[PDB]
């Protein structure tokens, strides 16, 4: 039942009662969730912490599916790796730009 | 059991077209096939596809 | 100090080039192009119409010229007075499509087939009143040819002789190819694919002293591309699909002798090395025939991306290093992929070259020389510096 | 090596015929056969603490200078004979000073926009102009609008320009029957 | 210039200077250790005697720091005041402080030298009289703290601009702003001069030409579409690729190799100056890690090289050279590598000195163009080579088993080439 | 339960609309469709996005 | 048939792989404790 | 791809995709397996076509999962490449839903391409 889920609904996984009160009334949603804790989330500065929660709950999205619905599944974490991966070079290369002139 | 290929003859201008008879020729690799247009079409099996049509 | 492993050293202090210079080149540097721009071919006499069809003669400096207004020009090019050689208007017969033809036979021949959508092609024999001919008679074969309009010109040998001849090959309605004689006007061969045809190429390949082969590439929309062998009847002999690829509007092939590169001498027919499929999505798979001619799924070797419409040009240069995409669909679409790098040169065209809404496009067999014309008639001429 | 300064003065006039360092001084004179005549200032070093090899390069100081070819025309600029304007087959058309030579100034060929917004079309690398056959000055409205109306070899337009800002004006002048400027005018 | 201009002028010349208490506390709080309430209130022995305590932990670690516990750390350098001596003594103690930052600039990992070089901070005040010195030897540590200790006390360069914003805050400098630093050219003067005293003093190590060498090929990558940049950066680049293969360090010679390839397939160099670059890899090759990197750049070399002769030979000198460094036992062991690294044109190039140069060893070339396959031009040359020397003298068993590899693959080519030049039944009856 | 199916269905119809508004207010090159009777609508240009 | 030896050297190159502004970005995160040769490795990979 | 069940053929598959292309000029499709599922759980989907490229498929394979739960077509196209060009963007599209309007253009060939894959189910 996660694994049939969207991944924007995995990012806000956590945070129900803010993201229902700011969609009842025509607030903001919260961003983090339940995700929030996770350590690349926690590795984020700023409010690229609410980008690479968007795009870890992509990926543990992907991998989570995979890992509920697959059947020759290895237990060796390769899905998980490589898209750990990709959270890794994308939250590199947003935190090596900055929004200062030089 | 799925389908491979589909081939489509050369359909009427002023009616709808129906294939009656397909045959198939061993020697040659090729489906010999009559249709409501009146033409007898000769399909390469393998490339799934004319090789000459007759309007016989 | 010093009165006079240090190599690197002496040959910096002495050089004040660090690159090579003029004919030590001999192929395109990439990402930069060399590239200026001349008068306008047709400066000299305004079109009436947009430019559908644009072709540069073999041998002679001339450019055709045709659109919708039914007439078709012929320009003496240079760069400094592109003077129109002569103008012939053929009334009520819009031309798409036009083409200079020169045979292997004698080089002697110099027809001009205009086309469009009429149930009739037009061969304007030239030797400078004009003498024209309209092949009319699609010889028992009527019901699968409602136009003219998609036709492209090619060699054929008859291979029980070693005679050459020119075929027309018209793209019909079902699937077909209806390859006529050029010089009779005889039906002499049909090659049917599956799905809706879209477009087609020649891939000429040599065989011995003086005999070639020639190999029909026609596609479909789907992508899935058939290969017809036709110096001997019109039999299949591959089968591929183009990976990706979902509606194609354009194929064409390259670096040897295709129909808008066309050689002059039996001997001088080569084997067309890059094929590239452009698709309505504006996306440009690329193939290179030196090895992806067996797998029957073949890989592109990149898929250029570039240009967001539909692709509806795409030529590779006479000696196979550039190809030019462009879409007839938004103004200022063409760009010049350089090949085998397969990137896309920077520097032109730049966002104030007068490209308009490029609808043909035509490279010149010898001198390097670009000609892109337009929806307002408007054939600009640039000439490629690098050879 | 430090740097050089390419094409500082025209090869086909002679190259740079004398360069020479004012002794003491970071500045240098060259001066070449197409009648010019400038300087170049070595800046001091940009780096603090080394400052002998990061060499800051040559820059343009003070410059003299003249036509090249001789001229083809002359025309007084204003009644108190203090300035002329000058233009010659180099394609440039100077105003000269009578009264001091230090206020002789090319007139500038940097054109204006466009009136609507359309591009200007035209190369890119720049050239100057064709060389001037005719031009004719009345600065009765000077500083106001465009006062000089010059006539170029084989074109088929006269342009304007600018006496007081010393530059082009905003406007071509065309002949509209297809035929090169013969002569101008302008009214007082 | 305004007067306050003309003032500044004298402000930044007598910046240093202690004029009142109140300039003492605010020049005196620049600590690299300490904060501002502490570093105010110490006095010149506690930090002097705690970094000679450091100095010689230091110098018990690395043992040619004892020469600056001779001067520079000595007990009569507490009262050697810095603006109080002429311009003569100022330069020979600021050399001998240049001396002690590029020794030092290896060893900024670990806390003996953060005591030991505060107290050049705190006497002779180097964050601002010595500065570029000490940020070009700390410039690796960007990422670390040590760098965020010099930048929040240092006062700034104006080569060093870029790091402006920087300067007192809590993210060290980022990649991309180490790069738009380097993209100077003045600055890469600066630089490759410090790199010419880092390697004439022999003080070069590795974590420092692996921040040198990323940041080099990453400015090559950042002006690569403009031409005229390359070209200003050619004599910078490639004459420190010059000083960094004449050492002796595999380290800074394997630098000097990334260097000179990313250069080379960014734009293309002149046959002349690829020729010399290669002579000088060749020329001080010691180990087997700078003879890998040496081939595989000299392939790479080679092979981004367009134009007509760039299949010719490798000259007389450069080949006999190169088959000093490399046997062709070496290079029959690179080829029969299953990764394929494309070395067309430098084989090509390889073959033909060999069949112009050598004239005894065939069956080698045989081999090798067995394990590597080349190209059609390239084998057509080669042929041509092996026709004229079959000309030149008696074509033995070698020469002809070249012949007949030559006709089994592709007999149409080795036909075309003696219709060019010779006959079918001559060089049969020459065979 | 008819309520609910009711309100639901114009709940549907107002996101619809909504929706197609902010799809209009994009970017991308598109045309106003008219069609018989009145019913507007907006057809985009056959154009991939970058 | 020097215009045919001309187009078969035209003819006989290889897709090589070009420097782009980014492409060398991503080694800063990983010089760091490594080896010399490891890194011209890591270079050449992305050169071929 | 072995589970990849109702697998279109050439001309189905040609079919499916010049709706997917005309939907997309209307606006009428969600692209992406996340926005796909999403449609699925509003129940606003016509029907869902996958790809069967997907290189870990199990990306995929949980939308026929709950399209089984809600009687909606589903089918199968070969490539992931193609459908991402027929949707008319420039990435690989791994799943696209189209979205239900009733005074839509492509209304017919919207039903008659999804009877055409419910009768292979």
Same mark, same amino acid.
């Given at each position: 039942?996660?694994?049939?889920?969207?991944?924007?609904?995995?990012?806000?996984?956590?945070?129900?009662?803010?993201?229902?009160?700011?969609?009842?009334?025509?607030?903001?949603?919260?961003?983090?969730?339940?995700?929030?804790?996770?350590?690349?989330?926690?590795?984020?500065?700023?409010?690229?912490?609410?980008?690479?929660?968007?795009?870890?709950?992509?990926?543990?999205?992907?991998?989570?599916?995979?890992?509920?619905?697959?059947?020759?599944?290895?237990?060796?974490?390769?899905?998980?790796?490589?898209?750990?991966?990709?959270?890794?070079?994308?939250?590199?290369?947003?935190?090596?730009?900055?929004?200062?002139?030089? | 059991?799925?389908?491979?290929?589909?081939?489509?003859?050369?359909?009427?201008?002023?009616?709808?077209?129906?294939?009656?008879?397909?045959?198939?020729?061993?020697?040659?690799?090729?489906?010999?096939?009559?249709?409501?247009?009146?033409?007898?079409?000769?399909?390469?099996?393998?490339?799934?596809?004319?090789?000459?049509?007759?309007?016989? | 100090?010093?009165?006079?492993?240090?190599?690197?050293?002496?040959?910096?202090?002495?050089?004040?080039?660090?690159?090579?210079?003029?004919?030590?080149?001999?192929?395109?540097?990439?990402?930069?192009?060399?590239?200026?721009?001349?008068?306008?071919?047709?400066?000299?006499?305004?079109?009436?119409?947009?430019?559908?069809?644009?072709?540069?003669?073999?041998?002679?400096?001339?450019?055709?010229?045709?659109?919708?207004?039914?007439?078709?020009?012929?320009?003496?090019?240079?760069?400094?007075?592109?003077?129109?050689?002569?103008?012939?208007?053929?009334?009520?017969?819009?031309?798409?499509?036009?083409?200079?033809?020169?045979?292997?036979?004698?080089?002697?021949?110099?027809?001009?087939?205009?086309?469009?959508?009429?149930?009739?092609?037009?061969?304007?024999?030239?030797?400078?009143?004009?003498?024209?001919?309209?092949?009319?008679?699609?010889?028992?074969?009527?019901?699968?040819?409602?136009?003219?309009?998609?036709?492209?010109?090619?060699?054929?040998?008859?291979?029980?002789?070693?005679?050459?001849?020119?075929?027309?090959?018209?793209?019909?309605?079902?699937?077909?190819?209806?390859?006529?004689?050029?010089?009779?006007?005889?039906?002499?061969?049909?090659?049917?694919?599956?799905?809706?045809?879209?477009?087609?190429?020649?891939?000429?390949?040599?065989?011995?002293?003086?005999?070639?082969?020639?190999?029909?590439?026609?596609?479909?929309?789907?992508?899935?591309?058939?290969?017809?062998?036709?110096?001997?009847?019109?039999?299949?002999?591959?089968?591929?699909?183009?990976?990706?690829?979902?509606?194609?509007?354009?194929?064409?092939?390259?670096?040897?002798?295709?129909?808008?590169?066309?050689?002059?001498?039996?001997?001088?027919?080569?084997?067309?090395?890059? @094929? #590239? %499929? +452009?698709? =309505?999505? &504006?996306? /440009?798979? $690329?193939?290179?025939? !030196?090895?992806?001619?067996?797998?029957?799924?073949?890989?592109?070797?990149?898929?250029?991306?570039?240009?967001?419409?539909?692709?509806?040009?795409?030529?590779?240069?006479?000696?196979?290093?550039?190809?030019?995409?462009?879409?007839?669909?938004?103004?200022?679409?063409?760009?010049?992929?350089?090949?085998?790098?397969?990137?896309?040169?920077?520097?032109?065209?730049?966002?104030?070259?007068?490209?308009?809404?490029?609808?043909?496009?035509?490279?010149?067999?010898?001198?390097?020389? @670009? #000609? %892109? +014309?337009? =929806?307002? &008639?408007? /054939?600009? $001429?640039?000439?490629? !510096?690098?050879? | 090596?430090?740097?050089?300064?390419?094409?500082?003065?025209?090869?086909?006039?002679?190259?740079?015929?004398?360069?020479?360092?004012?002794?003491?001084?970071?500045?240098?004179?060259?001066?070449?056969?197409?009648?010019?005549?400038?300087?170049?200032?070595?800046?001091?070093?940009?780096?603090?603490?080394?400052?002998?090899?990061?060499?800051?390069?040559?820059?343009?100081?003070?410059?003299?200078?003249?036509?090249?070819?001789?001229?083809?025309?002359?025309?007084?600029?204003?009644?108190?004979?203090?300035?002329?304007?000058?233009?010659?087959?180099?394609?440039?058309?100077?105003?000269?000073?009578?009264?001091?030579?230090?206020?002789?100034?090319?007139?500038?060929?940097?054109?204006?926009?466009?009136?609507?917004?359309?591009?200007?079309?035209?190369?890119?690398?720049?050239?100057?102009?064709?060389?001037?056959?005719?031009?004719?000055?009345?600065?009765?409205?000077?500083?106001?609008?465009?006062?000089?109306?010059?006539?170029?070899?084989?074109?088929?337009?006269?342009?304007?320009?600018?006496?007081?800002?010393?530059?082009?004006?905003?406007?071509?002048?065309?002949?509209?029957?297809?035929?090169?400027?013969?002569?101008?005018?302008?009214?007082? | 210039?305004?007067?306050?201009?003309?003032?500044?002028?004298?402000?930044?010349?007598?910046?240093?200077?202690?004029?009142?208490?109140?300039?003492?506390?605010?020049?005196?709080?620049?600590?690299?250790?300490?904060?501002?309430?502490?570093?105010?209130?110490?006095?010149?022995?506690?930090?002097?005697?705690?970094?000679?305590?450091?100095?010689?932990?230091?110098?018990?670690?690395?043992?040619?720091?004892?020469?600056?516990?001779?001067?520079?750390?000595?007990?009569?350098?507490?009262?050697?005041?810095?603006?109080?001596?002429?311009?003569?003594?100022?330069?020979?103690?600021?050399?001998?402080?240049?001396?002690?930052?590029?020794?030092?600039?290896?060893?900024?990992?670990?806390?003996?030298?953060?005591?030991?070089?505060?107290?050049?901070?705190?006497?002779?005040?180097?964050?601002?009289?010595?500065?570029?010195?000490?940020?070009?030897?700390?410039?690796?540590?960007?990422?670390?703290?040590?760098?965020?200790?010099?930048?929040?006390?240092?006062?700034?360069?104006?080569?060093?601009?870029?790091?402006?914003?920087?300067?007192?805050?809590?993210?060290?400098?980022?990649?991309?702003?180490?790069?738009?630093?380097?993209?100077?050219?003045?600055?890469?003067?600066?630089?490759?001069?410090?790199?010419?005293?880092?390697?004439?003093?022999?003080?070069?190590?590795?974590?420092?030409?692996?921040?040198?060498?990323?940041?080099?090929?990453?400015?090559?990558?950042?002006?690569?579409?403009?031409?005229?940049?390359?070209?200003?950066?050619?004599?910078?680049?490639?004459?420190?690729?010059?000083?960094?293969?004449?050492?002796?360090?595999?380290?800074?010679?394997?630098?000097?190799?990334?260097?000179?390839?990313?250069?080379?397939?960014?734009?293309?160099?002149?046959?002349?100056?690829?020729?010399?670059?290669?002579?000088?890899?060749?020329?001080?090759?010691?180990?087997?890690?700078?003879?890998?990197?040496?081939?595989?750049?000299?392939?790479?070399?080679?092979?981004?090289?367009?134009?007509?002769?760039?299949?010719?030979?490798?000259?007389?000198?450069?080949?006999?050279?190169?088959?000093?460094?490399?046997?062709?036992?070496?290079?029959?062991?690179?080829?029969?590598?299953?990764?394929?690294?494309?070395?067309?044109?430098?084989?090509?190039?390889?073959?033909?000195?060999?069949?112009?140069?050598?004239?005894?060893?065939?069956?080698?070339?045989?081999?090798?163009?067995?394990?590597?396959?080349?190209?059609?031009?390239?084998?057509?040359?080669?042929?041509?080579?092996?026709?004229?020397?079959?000309?030149?003298?008696?074509?033995?068993?070698?020469?002809?088993?070249?012949?007949?590899?030559?006709?089994?693959?592709?007999?149409?080519?080795?036909?075309?080439?003696?219709?060019?030049?010779?006959?079918?039944?001559?060089?049969?009856?020459?065979? | 339960?008819?309520?609910?199916?009711?309100?639901?269905?114009?709940?549907?119809?107002?996101?619809?609309?909504?929706?197609?508004?902010?799809?209009?207010?994009?970017?991308?090159?598109?045309?106003?469709?008219?069609?018989?009777?009145?019913?507007?609508?907006?057809?985009?240009?056959?154009?991939?996005?970058? | 048939?020097?215009?045919?030896?001309?187009?078969?050297?035209?003819?006989?190159?290889?897709?090589?792989?070009?420097?782009?502004?980014?492409?060398?970005?991503?080694?800063?995160?990983?010089?760091?404790?490594?080896?010399?040769?490891?890194?011209?490795?890591?270079?050449?990979?992305?050169?071929? | 791809?072995?589970?990849?069940?109702?697998?279109?053929?050439?001309?189905?598959?040609?079919?499916?995709?010049?709706?997917?292309?005309?939907?997309?000029?209307?606006?009428?499709?969600?692209?992406?397996?996340?926005?796909?599922?999403?449609?699925?759980?509003?129940?606003?989907?016509?029907?869902?076509?996958?790809?069967?490229?997907?290189?870990?498929?199990?990306?995929?394979?949980?939308?026929?999962?709950?399209?089984?739960?809600?009687?909606?077509?589903?089918?199968?196209?070969?490539?992931?490449?193609?459908?991402?060009?027929?949707?008319?963007?420039?990435?690989?599209?791994?799943?696209?839903?189209?979205?239900?309007?009733?005074?839509?253009?492509?209304?017919?060939?919207?039903?008659?391409?999804?009877?055409?894959?419910?009768?292979?189910?």
């Amino acid at each position: 039942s996660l694994a049939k889920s969207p991944a924007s609904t995995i990012q806000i996984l956590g945070a129900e009662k803010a993201l229902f009160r700011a969609l009842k009334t025509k607030h903001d949603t919260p961003k983090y969730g339940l995700l929030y804790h996770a350590s690349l989330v926690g590795q984020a500065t700023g409010k690229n912490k609410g980008k690479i929660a968007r795009v870890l709950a992509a990926k543990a999205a992907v991998s989570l599916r995979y890992d509920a619905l697959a059947e020759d599944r290895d237990d060796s974490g390769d899905i998980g790796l490589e898209s750990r991966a990709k959270v890794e070079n994308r939250l590199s290369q947003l935190e090596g730009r900055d929004l200062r002139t030089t | 059991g799925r389908l491979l290929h589909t081939m489509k003859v050369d359909k009427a201008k002023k009616e709808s077209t129906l294939v009656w008879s397909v045959i198939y020729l061993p020697r040659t690799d090729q489906i010999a096939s009559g249709d409501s247009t009146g033409s007898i079409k000769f399909w390469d099996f393998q490339f799934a596809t004319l090789n000459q049509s007759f309007k016989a | 100090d010093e009165s006079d492993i240090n190599a690197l050293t002496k040959i910096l202090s002495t050089t004040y080039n660090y690159k090579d210079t003029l004919s030590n080149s001999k192929l395109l540097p990439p990402k930069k192009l060399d590239i200026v721009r001349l008068k306008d071919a047709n400066a000299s006499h305004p079109s009436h119409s947009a430019i559908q069809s644009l072709s540069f003669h073999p041998s002679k400096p001339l450019l055709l010229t045709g659109g919708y207004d039914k007439t078709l020009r012929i320009y003496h090019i240079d760069g400094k007075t592109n003077h129109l050689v002569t103008s012939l208007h053929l009334v009520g017969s819009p031309i798409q499509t036009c083409t200079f033809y020169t045979s292997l036979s004698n080089q002697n021949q110099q027809n001009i087939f205009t086309a469009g959508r009429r149930r009739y092609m037009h061969s304007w024999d030239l030797s400078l009143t004009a003498k024209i001919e309209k092949f009319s008679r699609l010889y028992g074969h009527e019901s699968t040819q409602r136009s003219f309009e998609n036709f492209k010109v090619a060699h054929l040998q008859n291979s029980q002789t070693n005679s050459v001849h020119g075929i027309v090959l018209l793209q019909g309605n079902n699937g077909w190819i209806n390859i006529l004689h050029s010089t009779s006007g005889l039906w002499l061969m049909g090659c049917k694919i599956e799905g809706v045809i879209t477009d087609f190429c020649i891939d000429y390949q040599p065989i011995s002293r003086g005999k070639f082969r020639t190999i029909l590439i026609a596609v479909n929309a789907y992508g899935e591309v058939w290969e017809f062998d036709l110096n001997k009847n019109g039999h299949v002999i591959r089968r591929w699909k183009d990976q990706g690829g979902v509606g194609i509007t354009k194929i064409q092939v390259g670096g040897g002798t295709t129909t808008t590169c066309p050689a002059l001498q039996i001997s001088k027919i080569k084997q067309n090395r890059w @094929l #590239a %499929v +452009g698709s =309505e999505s &504006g996306f /440009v798979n $690329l193939y290179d025939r !030196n090895n992806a001619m067996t797998s029957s799924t073949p890989t592109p070797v990149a898929a250029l991306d570039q240009l967001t419409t539909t692709i509806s040009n795409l030529q590779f240069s006479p000696d196979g290093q550039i190809l030019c995409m462009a879409s007839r669909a938004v103004k200022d679409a063409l760009r010049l992929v350089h090949l085998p790098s397969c990137s896309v040169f920077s520097n032109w065209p730049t966002s104030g070259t007068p490209l308009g809404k490029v609808t043909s496009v035509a490279f010149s067999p010898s001198g390097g020389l @670009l #000609a %892109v +014309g337009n =929806e307002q &008639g408007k /054939v600009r $001429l640039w000439k490629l !510096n690098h050879y | 090596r430090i740097h050089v300064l390419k094409n500082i003065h025209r090869e086909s006039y002679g190259g740079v015929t004398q360069a020479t360092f004012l002794n003491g001084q970071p500045i240098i004179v060259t001066s070449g056969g197409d009648n010019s005549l400038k300087e170049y200032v070595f800046d001091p070093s940009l780096s603090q603490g080394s400052g002998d090899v990061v060499v800051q390069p040559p820059r343009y100081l003070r410059s003299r200078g003249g036509h090249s070819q001789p001229p083809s025309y002359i025309a007084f600029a204003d009644s108190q004979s203090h300035f002329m304007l000058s233009a010659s087959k180099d394609r440039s058309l100077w105003s000269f000073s009578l009264r001091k030579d230090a206020q002789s100034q090319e007139m500038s060929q940097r054109l204006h926009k466009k009136q609507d917004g359309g591009r200007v079309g035209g190369s890119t690398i720049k050239s100057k102009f064709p060389e001037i056959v005719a031009l004719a000055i009345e600065n009765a409205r000077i500083g106001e609008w465009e006062n000089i109306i010059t006539a170029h070899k084989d074109e088929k337009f006269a342009r304007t320009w600018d006496m007081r800002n010393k530059r082009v004006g905003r406007w071509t002048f065309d002949t509209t029957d297809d035929g090169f400027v013969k002569s101008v005018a302008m009214s007082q | 210039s305004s007067l306050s201009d003309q003032l500044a002028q004298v402000a930044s010349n007598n910046a240093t200077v202690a004029l009142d208490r109140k300039r003492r506390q605010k020049l005196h709080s620049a600590s690299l250790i300490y904060n501002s309430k502490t570093a105010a209130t110490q006095d010149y022995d506690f930090i002097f005697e705690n970094a000679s305590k450091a100095l010689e932990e230091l110098s018990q670690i690395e043992p040619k720091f004892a020469i600056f516990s001779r001067t520079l750390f000595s007990e009569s350098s507490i009262s050697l005041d810095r603006n109080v001596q002429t311009k003569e003594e100022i330069k020979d103690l600021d050399n001998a402080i240049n001396a002690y930052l590029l020794l030092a600039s290896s060893k900024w990992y670990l806390a003996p030298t953060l005591h030991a070089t505060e107290w050049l901070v705190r006497r002779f005040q180097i964050h601002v009289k010595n500065t570029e010195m000490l940020l070009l030897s700390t410039l690796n540590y960007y990422q670390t703290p040590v760098f965020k200790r010099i930048l929040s006390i240092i006062k700034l360069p104006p080569l060093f601009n870029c790091l402006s914003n920087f300067v007192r805050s809590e993210k060290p400098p980022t990649a991309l702003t180490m790069i738009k630093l380097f993209n100077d050219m003045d600055f890469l003067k600066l630089y490759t001069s410090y790199l010419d005293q880092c390697i004439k003093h022999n003080a070069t190590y590795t974590n420092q030409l692996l921040f040198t060498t990323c940041c080099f090929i990453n400015v090559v990558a950042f002006n690569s579409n403009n031409d005229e940049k390359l070209n200003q950066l050619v004599p910078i680049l490639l004459e420190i690729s010059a000083k960094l293969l004449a050492s002796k360090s595999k380290d800074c010679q394997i630098a000097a190799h990334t260097i000179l390839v990313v250069f080379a397939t960014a734009l293309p160099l002149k046959k002349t100056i690829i020729l010399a670059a290669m002579e000088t890899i060749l020329s001080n090759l010691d180990a087997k890690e700078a003879k890998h990197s040496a081939l595989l750049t000299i392939c790479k070399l080679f092979q981004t090289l367009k134009g007509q002769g760039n299949v010719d030979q490798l000259p007389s000198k450069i080949f006999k050279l190169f088959d000093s460094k490399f046997d062709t036992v070496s290079i029959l062991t690179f080829l029969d590598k299953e990764d394929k690294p494309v070395c067309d044109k430098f084989i090509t190039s390889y073959t033909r000195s060999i069949a112009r140069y050598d004239r005894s060893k065939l069956n080698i070339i045989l081999s090798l163009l067995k394990k590597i396959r080349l190209e059609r031009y390239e084998v057509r040359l080669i042929i041509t080579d092996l026709i004229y020397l079959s000309e030149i003298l008696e074509d033995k068993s070698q020469l002809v088993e070249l012949f007949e590899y030559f006709i089994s693959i592709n007999e149409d080519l080795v036909l075309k080439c003696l219709k060019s030049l010779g006959l079918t039944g001559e060089l049969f009856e020459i065979r | 339960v008819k309520q609910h199916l009711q309100r639901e269905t114009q709940l549907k119809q107002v996101q619809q609309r909504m929706d197609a508004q902010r799809e209009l207010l994009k970017k991308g090159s598109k045309k106003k469709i008219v069609d018989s009777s009145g019913k507007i609508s907006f057809k985009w240009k056959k154009q991939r996005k970058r | 048939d020097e215009e045919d030896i001309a187009l078969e050297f035209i003819n006989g190159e290889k897709k090589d792989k070009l420097v782009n502004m980014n492409s060398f970005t991503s080694m800063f995160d990983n010089i760091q404790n490594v080896q010399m040769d490891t890194f011209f490795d890591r270079v050449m990979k992305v050169l071929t | 791809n072995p589970k990849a069940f109702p697998l279109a053929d050439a001309a189905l598959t040609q079919q499916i995709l010049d709706v997917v292309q005309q939907a997309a000029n209307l606006r009428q499709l969600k692209k992406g397996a996340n926005e796909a599922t999403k449609t699925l759980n509003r129940g606003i989907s016509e029907f869902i076509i996958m790809a069967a490229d997907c290189e870990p498929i199990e990306i995929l394979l949980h939308l026929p999962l709950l399209c089984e739960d809600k009687n909606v077509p589903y089918v199968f196209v070969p490539s992931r490449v193609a459908l991402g060009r027929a949707c008319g963007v420039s990435r690989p599209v791994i799943a696209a839903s189209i979205t239900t309007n009733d005074a839509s253009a492509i209304k017919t060939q919207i039903y008659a391409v999804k009877d055409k894959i419910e009768t292979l189910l």
